[PDB]
Structures are given as structure tokens and as C-alpha cells.
């Protein structure tokens, strides 16, 4: 078991770009908390780290410019999404999170086949790569949009399906 990690129900996000996922604001606040504390000190939102932490502790204490601070915290960063059972490496993929209202993770349609995910109640885990190195590995090697062909067969694995095919065919 591991820190900086969460899970939730997944939901389709049609508007996402292939390299993006939808991450609920509250999850992102907890997943990124030390970064957010720092960034809050770096602005006037709290004198120091510990004041900021007490502020985020109570939900009715949470201000508005903290959501803006969070958005600066996640800029260009990726999270890892995982759906168990993790049968091949594409059971884990890196995504740039887009913050959303709501409590569901928003997953891009074209990665569902590789995750073997659909939307009849599946849940997924999310994880934060911390260091510059882990973050670099995740953005170069594990990004959804850099993993398009199957390593088993060489054939496309991110590819049109269901409605996408249906409309294009029509």
C-alpha cells in the first residue's frame, strides 16, 4: 500500500484530449496536499505551511483562491490511472489531470479498450509520481498518447470503437 493515492468511480469524458483525464477537485486537493501547502505559502493565502494545513482541514474554511493555487500546482504534471486486474502494462497510464467538480474520475474513450474499462460501475486508482525523475518517466514513457500500438501484436490499441465507428461508418 502506498501514499499519494486514491480511487473513485470512473465516468466517460468525451471532451478530454487523449493525454487528459478528469480528476475531482477534492481528490486533487488531497493527492497534492504538500505541493498545495507550499504554493499557498508562496502566495498570501497563508503565512506559513501549518496555517495553510489548518485552513484546508475544515471544509467550510476552504477559500476560493486555493483552487486557483491548486491549478498552478498541477500544471504540466501527470497522474497515473490504474484499473485492476492489471493484465499488461497499459493497465497503468499517465494523464494530465483536468480538475472537475464531481466525484468521478473522467476517462478518455480511446483508452477504455486497453484498460478493459467501461462504465457499468468500474472504479480506478490514481497515483502521484513525486520526483522530477518519476514525473519525467511518466510523461515520456507512460503517457497515454505515447502508447498507441500494442506491445503484444504491433497493431493499434488506442483506436475508434462503438459510437466513433458508428458515426464514421454512417
- Bind-site residues: 118, 120, 122
Which residues 113-132 are close enough to bind Mg ion by CB under 5 A?
118, 120, 122
Residue closer to other proteins (CB basis): 91 or 98: 91
Residue 165: φ, ψ to 5°: -60, -45
Total of chain residues touching DNA, rule CB under 7 A: 3
Q: Which of 14, 44, 76, 85 binds DNA (CB under 7 A)?
A: 85
Q: Which residues contact 24 (CB under 8 A, 6 or more apart)?
A: 8, 99, 100, 101, 102, 103, 104, 105
DSSP state of 76: T
Residue closer to Mg ion (CB basis): 48 or 116: 116
Q: Taking CB within 5 to 8 Å according to partner kind, which of DNA, other proteins, Mg ion, none is near residue 25?
A: none
Residue closer to DNA (CB basis): 9 or 136: 9
106 preceded by a cis bond (ω within 30 of 0): no
Q: Taking CB within 5 to 8 Å according to partner kind, which of other proteins, Mg ion, DNA, none is near residue 156?
A: none
Q: Which residues contact 143 (CB under 8 A, 6 or more apart)?
A: 19, 78, 93, 94, 95
Q: Check binding of 121 to DNA (CB under 7 A).
A: no
Give the closest residue to 129 by CA, choosing from 78, 73, 75, 72: 78
Shortest Cβ 84–DNA spacing (Å): 4
Residue closer to DNA (CB basis): 7 or 159: 7
Q: How far is CA 28 from CA 31, 65, 108, 131, 161, in A?
A: 5, 15, 18, 17, 30
Q: Which of 84, 148, 164, 166 binds DNA (CB under 7 A)?
A: 84
Give residues in contact with DNA (CB under 7 A): 7, 84-85
Amino acid at each position: 500500500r502506498v501514499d499519494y493515492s486514491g480511487r473513485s468511480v470512473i465516468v466517460v469524458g468525451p471532451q478530454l484530449k487523449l493525454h487528459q483525464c478528469g480528476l475531482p477537485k477534492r481528490m486533487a486537493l488531497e493527492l497534492f496536499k504538500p505541493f498545495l501547502l507550499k504554493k499557498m505559502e508562496e502566495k498570501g493565502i497563508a503565512p506559513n505551511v501549518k496555517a495553510a494545513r489548518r485552513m484546508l482541514e475544515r471544509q467550510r474554511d476552504i477559500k476560493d483562491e486555493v483552487w486557483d493555487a491548486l491549478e498552478e500546482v498541477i500544471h504540466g504534471k501527470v497522474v497515473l490511472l490504474n484499473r485492476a486486474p492489471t493484465l499488461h502494462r497499459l493497465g497503468i497510464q499517465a494523464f494530465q489531470p483536468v480538475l472537475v467538480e464531481g466525484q468521478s474520475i473522467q476517462l478518455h474513450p480511446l483508452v477504455c479498450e486497453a484498460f478493459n474499462a467501461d462504465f457499468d460501475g468500474d472504479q480506478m486508482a490514481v497515483h502521484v509520481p513525486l520526483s522530477s525523475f518519476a514525473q519525467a518517466e511518466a510523461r515520456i514513457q507512460m503517457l497515454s498518447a505515447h502508447n498507441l500500438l500494442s506491445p503484444a501484436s504491433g497493431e493499434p490499441l488506442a483506436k475508434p470503437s462503438r459510437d466513433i465507428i458508428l458515426g464514421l461508418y454512417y
